[PDB]
Amino acid sequence: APVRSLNCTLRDSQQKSLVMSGPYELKALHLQGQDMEQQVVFSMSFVQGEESNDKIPVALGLKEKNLYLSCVLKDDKPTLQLESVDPKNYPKKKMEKRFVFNKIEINNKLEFESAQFPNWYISTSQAENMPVFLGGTKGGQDITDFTMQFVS
Numbered sequence: 001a002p003v004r005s006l007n008c009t010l011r012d013s014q015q016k017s018l019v020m021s022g023p024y025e026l027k028a029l030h031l032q033g034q035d036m037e038q039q040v041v042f043s044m045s046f047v048q049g050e051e052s053n054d055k056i057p058v059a060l061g062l063k064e065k066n067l068y069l070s071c072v073l074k075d076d077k078p079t080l081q082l083e084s085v086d087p088k089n090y091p092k093k094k095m096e097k098r099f100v101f102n103k104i105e106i107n108n109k110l111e112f113e114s115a116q117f118p119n120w121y122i123s124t125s126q127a128e129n130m131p132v133f134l135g136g137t138k139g140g141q142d143i144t145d146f147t148m149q150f151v152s
């Protein structure tokens with residue numbers, strides 16, 4: 001049947017919100033009050049892929065935009081990008097692998113691993129107003145843990 005999707009926001013474990021930073025760029029910053037309207041709302045689709053109790057394959061599209069987070073090699077490195085798609089054809093249950101993240105629940109937090117690039121994760125910096133990026137460890141100074149908020 002159709003693909004099932006939920007509207008949501010994400011915040012990193014330091015409670016930074018995600019906003020735009022150009023036509024295809026996301027940054028993370030501390031946000032509260034009026035400025036919270038600036039945060040990106042995702043449509044999280046539950047897609048085809050290997051699945052277990054705590055590891056759920058999803059795609060992350062921007063709400064009512066034909067833009068998806070994707071993982072590709074750029075200048076020979078696994079990188080995160082926002083990629084446009086044909087709005088007639090998306091979302092779909094069989095999303096291409098570059099669009100698929102494994103949403104992993106550990107200790108009441110979420111990690112989003114690239115399905116395409118094992119052990120590469122959606123990451124934020126500790127500094128304010130820096131890009132969201134794909135980081136090659138769920139270790140170290142960069143942040144790989146998030147919480148989800150459900151949106152109407």
Ligand SMILES: NC(=O)c1cnc(C(F)(F)F)nc1
Nearest residue numbers: 025026080081082131132133
């Ligand atoms: N400048 C970056 O490292 C960067 C990568 N990826 C993104 C995305 F896809 F979240 F929007 N925004 C910025």
